[PDB]
Amino acid sequence: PSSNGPLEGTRGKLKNKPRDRGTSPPQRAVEEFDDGEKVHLKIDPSVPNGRFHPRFDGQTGTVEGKQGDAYKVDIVDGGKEKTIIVTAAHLRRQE
Amino acid sequence: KPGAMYRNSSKPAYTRREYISGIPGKKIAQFDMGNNGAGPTYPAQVELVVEKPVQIRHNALEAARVAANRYVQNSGAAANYKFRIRKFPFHVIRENKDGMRAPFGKPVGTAARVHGANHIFIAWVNPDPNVEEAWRRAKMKVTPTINIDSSPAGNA
Amino acid sequence: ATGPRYKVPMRRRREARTDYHQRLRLLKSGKPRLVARKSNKHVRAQLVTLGPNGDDTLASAHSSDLAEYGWEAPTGNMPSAYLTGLLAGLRAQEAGVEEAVLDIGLNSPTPGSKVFAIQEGAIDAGLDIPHNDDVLADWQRTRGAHIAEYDEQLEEPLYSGDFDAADLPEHFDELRETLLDGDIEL
Amino acid sequence: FHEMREPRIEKVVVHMGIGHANAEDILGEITGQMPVRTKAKRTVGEFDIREGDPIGAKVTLRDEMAEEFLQTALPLAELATSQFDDTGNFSFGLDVTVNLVRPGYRVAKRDKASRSIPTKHRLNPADAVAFIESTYDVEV
Amino acid sequence: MHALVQLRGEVNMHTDIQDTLEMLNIHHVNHCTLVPETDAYRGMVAKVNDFVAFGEPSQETLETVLATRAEPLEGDADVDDEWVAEHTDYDDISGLAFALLSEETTLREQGLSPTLRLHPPRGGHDGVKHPVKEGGQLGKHDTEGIDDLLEAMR
RNA sequence: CCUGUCAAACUCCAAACUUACAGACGCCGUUUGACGCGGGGAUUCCGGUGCGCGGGGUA
RNA sequence: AGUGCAAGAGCAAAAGAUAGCUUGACAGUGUUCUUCCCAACGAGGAACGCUGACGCGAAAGCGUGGUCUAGCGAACCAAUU
RNA sequence: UUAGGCGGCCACAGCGGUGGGGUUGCCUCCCGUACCCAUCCCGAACACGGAAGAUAAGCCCACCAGCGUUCCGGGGAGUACUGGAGUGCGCGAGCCUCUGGGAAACCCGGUUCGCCGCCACC
Numbered sequence: 001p002s003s004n005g006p007l008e009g010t011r012g013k014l015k016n017k018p019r020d021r022g023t024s025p026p027q028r029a030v031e032e033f034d035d036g037e038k039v040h041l042k043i044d045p046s047v048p049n050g051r052f053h054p055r056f057d058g059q060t061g062t063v064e065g066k067q068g069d070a071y072k073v074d075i076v077d078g079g080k081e082k083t084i085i086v087t088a089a090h091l092r093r094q095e
Numbered sequence: 096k097p098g099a100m101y102r103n104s105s106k107p108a109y110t111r112r113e114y115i116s117g118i119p120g121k122k123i124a125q126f127d128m129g130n131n132g133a134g135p136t137y138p139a140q141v142e143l144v145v146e147k148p149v150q151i152r153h154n155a156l157e158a159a160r161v162a163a164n165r166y167v168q169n170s171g172a173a174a175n176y177k178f179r180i181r182k183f184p185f186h187v188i189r190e191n192k193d194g195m196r197a198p199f200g201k202p203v204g205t206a207a208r209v210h211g212a213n214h215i216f217i218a219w220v221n222p223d224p225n226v227e228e229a230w231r232r233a234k235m236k237v238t239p240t241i242n243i244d245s246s247p248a249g250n251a
Numbered sequence: 252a253t254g255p256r257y258k259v260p261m262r263r264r265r266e267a268r269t270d271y272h273q274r275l276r277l278l279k280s281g282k283p284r285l286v287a288r289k290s291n292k293h294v295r296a297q298l299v300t301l302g303p304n305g306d307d308t309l310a311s312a313h314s315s316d317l318a319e320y321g322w323e324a325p326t327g328n329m330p331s332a333y334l335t336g337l338l339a340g341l342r343a344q345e346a347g348v349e350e351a352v353l354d355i356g357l358n359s360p361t362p363g364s365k366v367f368a369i370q371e372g373a374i375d376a377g378l379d380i381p382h383n384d385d386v387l388a389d390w391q392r393t394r395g396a397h398i399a400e401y402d403e404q405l406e407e408p409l410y411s412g413d414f415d416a417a418d419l420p421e422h423f424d425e426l427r428e429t430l431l432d433g434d435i436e437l
Numbered sequence: 438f439h440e441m442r443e444p445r446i447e448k449v450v451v452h453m454g455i456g457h458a459n460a461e462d463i464l465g466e467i468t469g470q471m472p473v474r475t476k477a478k479r480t481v482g483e484f485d486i487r488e489g490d491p492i493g494a495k496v497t498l499r500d501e502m503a504e505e506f507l508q509t510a511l512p513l514a515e516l517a518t519s520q521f522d523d524t525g526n527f528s529f530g531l532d533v534t535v536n537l538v539r540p541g542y543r544v545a546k547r548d549k550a551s552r553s554i555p556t557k558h559r560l561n562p563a564d565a566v567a568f569i570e571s572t573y574d575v576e577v
Numbered sequence: 578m579h580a581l582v583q584l585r586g587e588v589n590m591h592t593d594i595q596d597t598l599e600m601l602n603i604h605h606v607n608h609c610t611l612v613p614e615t616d617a618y619r620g621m622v623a624k625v626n627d628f629v630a631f632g633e634p635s636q637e638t639l640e641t642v643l644a645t646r647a648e649p650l651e652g653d654a655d656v657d658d659e660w661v662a663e664h665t666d667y668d669d670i671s672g673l674a675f676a677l678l679s680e681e682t683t684l685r686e687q688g689l690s691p692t693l694r695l696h697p698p699r700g701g702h703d704g705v706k707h708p709v710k711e712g713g714q715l716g717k718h719d720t721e722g723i724d725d726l727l728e729a730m731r
Numbered sequence: 732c733c734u735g736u737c738a739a740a741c742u743c744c745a746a747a748c749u750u751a752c753a754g755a756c757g758c759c760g761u762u763u764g765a766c767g768c769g770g771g772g773a774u775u776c777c778g779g780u781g782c783g784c785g786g787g788g789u790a
Numbered sequence: 791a792g793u794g795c796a797a798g799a800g801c802a803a804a805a806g807a808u809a810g811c812u813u814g815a816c817a818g819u820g821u822u823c824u825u826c827c828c829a830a831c832g833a834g835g836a837a838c839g840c841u842g843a844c845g846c847g848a849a850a851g852c853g854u855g856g857u858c859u860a861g862c863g864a865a866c867c868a869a870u871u
Numbered sequence: 872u873u874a875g876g877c878g879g880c881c882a883c884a885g886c887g888g889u890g891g892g893g894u895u896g897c898c899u900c901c902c903g904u905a906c907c908c909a910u911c912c913c914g915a916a917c918a919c920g921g922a923a924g925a926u927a928a929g930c931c932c933a934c935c936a937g938c939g940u941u942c943c944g945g946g947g948a949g950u951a952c953u954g955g956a957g958u959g960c961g962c963g964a965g966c967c968u969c970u971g972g973g974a975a976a977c978c979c980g981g982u983u984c985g986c987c988g989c990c991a992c993c
């Protein structure tokens with residue numbers, strides 16, 4: 001890469017299709033998850049806060065406690081174990 | 096310079112003028128010849144069909160187009176026919192003219208990318224195919240082998 | 252509308268009904284909301300919660316079904332709103348609801364307004380609602396005193412027939428008194 | 438149907454587009470209520486580079502305040518036609534504009550459930566001329 | 578139920594292909610296994626389509642091959658009718674053959690090596706550089722096609 | 732209105748495919764102890780070629 | 791359109807404009823991600839808490855500087871709380 | 872839901888257009904400024920108070936497809952592209968066969984003028 005910032009090579013994943021533009025619905029930013037639940041990580045281009053490193057977009061983690069309103073989701077990067085601080089707005093129930 | 100240097104479609108598409116400067120102008124004079132005032136209202140319509148994807152330098156186009164039109168003056172400077180070269184030299188081309196150090200070349204020209212089977216030239220004529228000859232002279236100056244194809248014309 | 256790339260607002264924004272930005276902030280408390288809504292002639296007070304396919308109303312009160320308890324005066328006024336607030340408040344309590352936050356829709360947070368009135372009532376009913384006393388009306392205006400005095404500059408009855416001529420902030424007391432004990436639907 | 442379709446005056450804006458005022462005074466008397474400052478946008482050659490800046494005053498008269506004004510304004514004007522809005526308005530003059538519309542306009546100017554007034558319920562240049570012409574004067 | 582037979586070696590064949598072959602109990606050229614027709618098994622023979630030869634065998638042929646190249650999960654023991662009877666739920670090779678074909682059981686389930694270690698095809702096969710439709714011996718076979726190959730390697 | 736063309740730094744579209752998690756089968760592990768954890772000892776950080784996909788270059 | 795600046799991305803009852811008020815660009819201590827995919831490695835950076843003190847709001851609530859990704863620096867010595 | 876309040880999905884719901892509907896549950900327009908509250912100026916808005924009038928707006932109801940959008944049939948197309956394989960072809964660029972996937976534009980015909988949840992209510 002020509003630079004090594006966090007948003008390097010994220011033009012696609014952190015951009016909205018024109019119609020899905022503008023503020024997102026609150027219903028999913030308030031969703032409540034319980035420790036144990038499988039959740040899919042995907043940043044909402046509209047939602048500035050509660051994000052996580054773009055590199056994890058696409059992960060399906062397990063909710064294990066929370067910090068503030070933010071959730072703590074455990075994922076496995078490659079073969080490494082990691083804990084991701086992400087808000088509901090950027091999460092979805094698996095299945 | 097030789098056609099062997101840019102006749103293949105092996106480089107990525109390089110056409111964005113917003114990121115390229117110093118693009119030589121196209122030598123191609125016109126794309127519509129003959130009676131452009133009238134519309135394709137002719138009985139016969141032959142086409143020069145390229146047989147292999149290649150790149151055709153605006154050099155080749157102009158030389159191929161003149162040679163045919165210039166020849167289509169077997170019909171008169173204001174003859175009854177309409178000639179058309181449907182391709183435009185979009186693909187920009189460079190040359191590394193230091194050795195291989197910082198070798199990204201400098202824009203030296205443009206070439207149009209034609210895929211095999213596309214028709215580069217189209218002429219419209221009444222049962223008076225002198226055009227078929229204007230094209231034996233045209234694909235004479237372009238890299239690829241070509242097929243001279245006739246569409247509306249069962250007046251054989 | 253114009254093209255594939257055109258962005259159409261959320262239905263409830265087209266209709267100019269729900270302030271979503273304000274809705275997120277509300278929902279944040281994680282408590283039930285005390286929906287305070289008005290109409291030219293009435294006043295409604297709901298206690299909404301969050302659901303799978305949309306909100307769920309657990310308890311409510313309309314200034315209309317206020318007469319069902321002895322209300323014989325208009326219903327688009329200060330006293331009217333309060334009691335409906337209190338009335339919804341009680342049915343709320345019954346529901347097992349204990350706390351909520353005041354959603355005033357696209358209304359203005361003007362001091363002594365009827366929406367704070369609705370809040371003041373739902374509060375007294377037993378509900379725990381974050382609030383601020385000095386943004387509420389001075390009680391008297393809640394009883395309907397402002398209207399009694401306004402009919403003092405009579406010469407012509409404020410109420411087209413209706414009930415009384417000099418109006419009754421006391422009829423207000425009578426009703427609040429009533430709702431604060433027993434009775435059906437509470 | 439009618440009654441709720443028949444024209445009415447909603448505000449008469451009287452503004453004095455100066456380039457830098459002392460003019461407020463006259464506007465206050467010619468109408469009867471305080472004027473408002475007219476800041477400008479963009480930096481321009483007419484030594485008008487200042488963004489926020491008093492460059493004139495206006496007054497929006499509603500109800501009687503509007504009639505009681507027009508009952509002298511109109512007389513001082515001749516024009517009509519062409520000089521009318523596609524929405525049934527017209528500006529003459531110092532300026533004096535007259536906004537015209539039918540009864541249910543609040544739907545469009547309120548906060549809750551506001552809505553744009555349908556093209557059918559809008560006032561036409563013609564329907565406008567008639568209403569006013571029919572009130573102390575003549576068209577064209 | 579299809580009969581799988583590796584016809585091409587391991588040198589140079591993708592790893593994920595080779596592992597698939599190995600999960601299908603084949604670890605050597607000319608080794609054959611019997612695989613049920615299921616989505617999960619179909620995906621696997623497809624991945625393996627280019628180094629193997631498969632297809633549905635005729636009851637008869639399966640019988641020949643079973644008799645000639647079947648083996649107990651351990652040891653030399655000849656799987657003949659008696660063996661089958663005195664060891665499996667069936668009464669003879671044919672009864673086993675039928676069960677396999679109708680996918681009612683498996684070699685393992687009956688205490689047998691999942692692998693039929695076939696012999697080189699007598700007369701030589703049709704080549705490993707072309708599929709059947711091209712005169713080669715690779716890919717899916719006709720029941721008569723699979724039989725010829727199997728019987729040649731009986 | 733008609734008619735002639737394009738895009739590595741366009742996209743109203745849009746694969747194959749790669750990939751996260753889960754279940755199923757398969758294979759593997761529970762005396763051949765997998766998965767994993769802790770620790771000792773390295774070597775190694777001139778690579779190359781074929782194929783597919785490439786970027787540069789007349790090559 | 792605007793949002794200080796590259797480029798790409800976010801934003802409309804706003805993240806932009808105006809007005810007013812205010813100094814949370816606050817003190818303290820953490821969790822996590824990043825820096826360094828995987829996979830060890832410091833400074834730095836970010837996201838998310840908590841404790842304490844505040845600002846604004848009716849309130850939910852927002853403020854751990856400027857919408858996001860650049861604007862940064864070990865030991866030794868010095869000066870300062 | 873003979874007109875309401877809060878919503879979810881966020882155009883299948885947009886844009887444009889036609890018809891119908893109210894002594895009342897009603898919603899509105901509407902009438903009106905003593906109060907609470909309000910306009911850098913205006914009871915326009917906001918806020919309060921209220922029914923003389925109205926169904927013309929809005930709104931609710933029924934419907935139209937011309938544009939925008941969603942999905943489906945037939946055609947384009949098993950075409951373009953492609954994961955695996957080849958001592959198949961080609962000077963070569965590149966192509967072909969087998970195997971497993973499989974599109975976009977456009978045309979013609981249908982579909983779409985929202986669906987659903989909670990509450991309240993002749």
Ligand SMILES: [Cl-]
Nearest residue numbers: 052053084823
């Ligand atoms: Cl993270």
Ligand SMILES: [Cl-]
Nearest residue numbers: 288289356358
């Ligand atoms: Cl309301």
Ligand SMILES: [Mg+2]
Nearest residue numbers: 009011012013
């Ligand atoms: Mg990309």
Ligand SMILES: [Mg+2]
Nearest residue numbers: 649650651652
């Ligand atoms: Mg053995």
Ligand SMILES: [Mg+2]
Nearest residue numbers: 698699700701
């Ligand atoms: Mg031999």
Ligand SMILES: [Mg+2]
Nearest residue numbers: 702703704705
């Ligand atoms: Mg051979």
Ligand SMILES: [Mg+2]
Nearest residue numbers: 748749750784
């Ligand atoms: Mg990839």
Ligand SMILES: [Mg+2]
Nearest residue numbers: 048049856857
């Ligand atoms: Mg920030």
Ligand SMILES: [Mg+2]
Nearest residue numbers: 864865866867
């Ligand atoms: Mg030193």
Ligand SMILES: [Mg+2]
Nearest residue numbers: 868869870871
């Ligand atoms: Mg110092």
Ligand SMILES: [Mg+2]
Nearest residue numbers: 891892926927
């Ligand atoms: Mg009507």
Ligand code: NA
Nearest residue numbers: 020022024046
């Ligand atoms: Na969005």
Ligand code: NA
Nearest residue numbers: 193194196197
């Ligand atoms: Na040099």
Ligand code: NA
Nearest residue numbers: 237238239240
């Ligand atoms: Na040639």
Ligand code: NA
Nearest residue numbers: 825833834835
């Ligand atoms: Na650090």
Ligand code: NA
Nearest residue numbers: 474476491911
């Ligand atoms: Na001022």
